[PDB]
RNA sequence: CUUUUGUAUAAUGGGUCAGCGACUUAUAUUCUGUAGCAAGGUUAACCGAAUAGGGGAGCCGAAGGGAAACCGAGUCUUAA
RNA sequence: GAGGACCGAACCGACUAAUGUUGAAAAAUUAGCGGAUGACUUGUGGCUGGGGGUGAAAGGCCAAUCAAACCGGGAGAUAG
RNA sequence: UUAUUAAAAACACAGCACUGUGCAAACACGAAAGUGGACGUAUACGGUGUGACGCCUGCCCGGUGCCGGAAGGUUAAUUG
RNA sequence: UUCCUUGUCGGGUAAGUUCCGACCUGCACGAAUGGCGUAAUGAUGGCCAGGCUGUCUCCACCCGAGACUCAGUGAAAUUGAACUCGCUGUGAAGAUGCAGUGUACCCGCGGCAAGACGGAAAGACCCCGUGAACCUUUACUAUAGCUUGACACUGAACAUU
RNA sequence: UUUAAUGUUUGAUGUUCUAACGUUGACCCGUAAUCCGGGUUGCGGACAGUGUCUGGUGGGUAGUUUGACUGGGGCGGUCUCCUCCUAAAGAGUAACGGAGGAGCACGAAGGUUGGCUAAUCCUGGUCGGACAUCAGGAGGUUAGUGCAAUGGCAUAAGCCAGCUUGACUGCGAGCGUGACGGCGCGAGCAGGUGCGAAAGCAGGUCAUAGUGAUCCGGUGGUUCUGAAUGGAAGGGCCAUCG
């Protein structure tokens with residue numbers, strides 16, 4: 001019938017890009033699905049928010065037999 | 077407090093707590109005030125005479141603030157454990 | 173808009189209680205669960221009661 | 224004449240040591256069944272008034 | 288001149304001159320400057336051949352935390 | 368010799384047109400027009416007062432004033 | 448009849464109908480006293496609608512109102 | 528009272544969206560907020576005819592009062608300042624004032640009203656204001672009045688139960 | 689066992705009575721007076737009427753309200769939340785721009801351990817059919833996910849079973865997102881618990897909608913407060929409801 005509705009933007013996306021130094025608990029990326037997967041020292045929240053489980057620099061890699069993007073923390 | 081019609085800050089927040097009528101008759105005394113008293117022995121009356129606490133004060137507590145140098149006899153006053161040590165360290169005496 | 177709010181009262185003497193919802197049309201049986209009672213600091217059984 | 228305190232503000236804000244104001248959180252009066260316990264737990268302690276709102280509070284509590 | 292995104296505007300106002308004509312006052316409060324004194328500062332009413340002097344009743348500050356009892360350089364939270 | 372009868376002056380009115388419209392006049396003049404023994408007209412005096420009066424009713428009229436008179440006061444009402 | 452842009456098909460009207468009113472009348476003006484209605488008494492008075500006269504004025508009581516009914520349901524102060 | 532609509536037919540006229548007569552397809556008549564008739568009446572509305580005419584074709588002349596000139600007296604609205612032309616273009620978008628260009632010796636008097644978005648009244652229309660007034664009602668909240676009961680002023684006797 | 693009737697308290701009314709009260713009936717006096725008052729009398733009579741309280745009625749009167757957005761206003765539509773596009777490869781980004789949804793559900797559809805892997809089609813086969821259950825092959829997620837869309841999902845987040853209540857209490861390093869109120873994610877710590885041999889996992893659900901501040905008030909609890917004192921009322925605090 002009639003349009004005119006929308007929802008508030010959710011501010012998704014990457015918060016800390018490759019090489020950035022983060023503290024433990026820092027949110028790395030907010031996402032709906034697991035577009036990015038948790039690697040080493042990275043947790044996956046209930047809404048699939050990837051957060052650093054240790055200090056260090058974030059690192060993006062593509063691994064596995066399905067070429068999936070992983071995010072890990074190079075502990076430094 | 078008017079914010080253009082939006083529910084102002086002091087109305088969208090809840091009220092909390094209550095006012096104690098005993099807090100209005102309670103005062104705190106610094107160690108540096110023990111020398112201002114006259115006679116050495118300190119109590120409610122001597123503190124009021126020295127214009128240190130209000131005339132309506134019924135309870136008084138000595139806290140570790142400032143410093144005491146002379147032997148003082150505290151009587152009928154609550155004393156913190158930190159001030160109790162400092163008063164006894166200056167040869168003072170505390171009696172309930 | 174069918175689920176009614178209920179409360180689960182602890183079997184212990186303490187008046188502590190949880191609150192939850194329940195569809196009383198499909199599930200007429202009383203709800204009983206083992207939940208942590210923070211007053212006695214033990215896991216006791218909680219029985220249903222009216223809110 | 225003396226400035227009159229907004230009495231409604233005096234019942235909701237307490238002045239802290241460094242001049243800030245503490246206040247109770249909203250959203251903890253009713254409708255808690257549907258609220259997650261984690262959410263309700265984080266609303267129990269008192270909070271400080273944000274920097275953007277101090278101007279409104281100070282104007283309402285001149286003797287605080 | 289005003290008002291406006293924008294006025295030679297054919298938008299407003301003024302025929303001209305002279306006189307008058309609009310951010311004040313009181314009391315509180317906060318900040319800045321300045322002066323005095325300084326962990327202290329200051330009096331109010333009132334007394335007073337009174338702008339002196341007296342008057343320290345009070346007020347602010349030197350301690351905070353907590354809804355509060357209460358504790359106190361810590362306190363609250365919690366069984367911790 | 369009846370009549371809210373007829374024609375028509377005074378008298379009362381105000382249908383048309385022109386003039387006038389900083390007028391002779393804050394409602395008139397000129398030429399025609401209606402009623403003209405009646406629910407007529409007029410003098411003097413009186414009564415009804417403002418959310419009230421009076422109204423053969425138009426929200427008409429109530430001192431050139433009316434969907435609530437005038438004067439003084441609240442009053443420097445309030446004016447995003 | 449709209450004083451001062453509307454005189455009319457508007458208002459009034461005689462007549463008609465409904466309805467209220469038994470007199471300390473209804474009703475109206477009045478905190479009240481009282482006064483009008485009326486020094487009248489239902490062939491009178493008030494209100495409402497219609498509007499000379501002629502021929503007429505059909506159907507609907509579900510809605511709203513009014514009138515009558517009093518059994519039952521509900522229901523105030525009060526009582527406790 | 529009929530939107531469609533200047534309905535259709537008839538009458539009147541050389542020609543009639545009006546008028547009169549009828550038809551009924553009454554957008555959306557109708558019976559006392561009356562229906563349909565109705566003699567008389569009307570500074571009432573519509574239409575037709577005779578008479579009459581400067582109403583007109585199409586104006587002409589004339590008589591008076593002004594206008595005009597002289598003497599006397601002597602206003603008003605309005606007004607940023609003016610050394611105050613046309614055109615085309617431009618531009619708060621319709622120019623005396625800008626650009627280009629044309630024209631134009633200086634100043635009156637009688638006339639005419641195209642322009643000066645001429646004068647007059649801080650638009651009556653329209654919108655807006657958490658403006659106003661008055662009016663309406665089964666808007667809300669009240670309330671005068673009207674009405675109900677209890678208690679008081681207010682008592683006795685006796686039935687009935 | 690029961691029944692009647694004389695004696696009593698309180699009502700429910702009525703038929704009398706006169707003495708309150710009414711009299712805008714008559715007469716008398718004040719009084720050379722249709723007011724008023726007093727008196728006599730008659731008629732009413734505990735009614736009427738008035739006061740306080742109370743229900744109903746009450747545009748008779750009064751005070752007011754009667755939203756905004758808007759290619760002028762009105763009318764229509766819209767107003768909060770979720771998903772996609774517009775959106776210009778970080779975030780964000782308008783229009784009465786283009787398309788759809790939500791105002792829940794679930795004690796299992798949650799936790800854990802163990803296992804499992806679709807759609808569709810072909811071939812063969814009792815009733816049996818285009819389509820039921822069976823078998824095989826192809827196929828490779830074209831399926832599934834409580835519900836819109838998007839992003840996800842095989843280690844499955846999809847499907848099945850066992851045991852269960854972590855849909856725990858106190859906290860919380862550190863971040864994300866908002867002008868703010870807020871909202872979101874969260875390792876780890878303490879207490880206690882479930883499943884598993886164990887490593888471990890669990891602070892609801894594949895994720896993102898399923899919502900409402902404050903005031904006022906209710907209910908339960910509470911080594912808080914208690915206006916002389918002891919209590920209590922009330923208040924506070926905690927949990928929760930409208």
Ligand SMILES: CC[C@H]1OC(=O)[C@H](C)[C@@H](O[C@H]2C[C@@](C)(OC)[C@@H](O)[C@H](C)O2)[C@H](C)[C@@H](O[C@@H]2O[C@H](C)C[C@H](N(C)C)[C@H]2O)[C@](C)(O)C[C@@H](C)[C@@H]2N[C@@H](COCCOC)O[C@H]([C@H]2C)[C@]1(C)O
Nearest residue numbers: 387388389390393394451452604645646647648650651652
């Ligand atoms: C007789 C002279 C009076 O003016 C008139 O009568 C004019 C004919 C009058 O206009 C009449 C006639 C009319 C047809 O306009 C021509 C009509 O539209 C207007 C409203 O009324 C003016 C133009 C009429 O003016 C017109 O007003 C309308 C609203 C807008 C017109 N214009 C701006 C477009 C404007 O021209 C005004 C308003 O009447 C003039 C006004 C300035 C004065 N007030 C009026 C008072 O009488 C009228 C009642 O007013 C309430 O009297 C005016 C002014 C003093 C005059 C000049 O005295």
Ligand SMILES: [Mg+2]
Nearest residue numbers: 127129130131
């Ligand atoms: Mg003192």
Ligand SMILES: [Mg+2]
Nearest residue numbers: 251252253928
């Ligand atoms: Mg609460």
Ligand SMILES: [Mg+2]
Nearest residue numbers: 290291298299
């Ligand atoms: Mg403008």
Ligand SMILES: [Mg+2]
Nearest residue numbers: 290291292293
């Ligand atoms: Mg500007």
Ligand SMILES: [Mg+2]
Nearest residue numbers: 291292293619
């Ligand atoms: Mg403009």
Ligand SMILES: [Mg+2]
Nearest residue numbers: 294295296618
């Ligand atoms: Mg310019």
Ligand SMILES: [Mg+2]
Nearest residue numbers: 296297298299
């Ligand atoms: Mg101008």
Ligand SMILES: [Mg+2]
Nearest residue numbers: 296297623643
């Ligand atoms: Mg000009």
Ligand SMILES: [Mg+2]
Nearest residue numbers: 297298299644
């Ligand atoms: Mg203008």
Ligand SMILES: [Mg+2]
Nearest residue numbers: 299300301606
């Ligand atoms: Mg001007």
Ligand SMILES: [Mg+2]
Nearest residue numbers: 371372373403
């Ligand atoms: Mg006559």
Ligand SMILES: [Mg+2]
Nearest residue numbers: 374375402403
């Ligand atoms: Mg005559």
Ligand SMILES: [Mg+2]
Nearest residue numbers: 397398399400
């Ligand atoms: Mg005449």
Ligand SMILES: [Mg+2]
Nearest residue numbers: 372373402403
């Ligand atoms: Mg006549």
Ligand SMILES: [Mg+2]
Nearest residue numbers: 425426434449
């Ligand atoms: Mg009218």
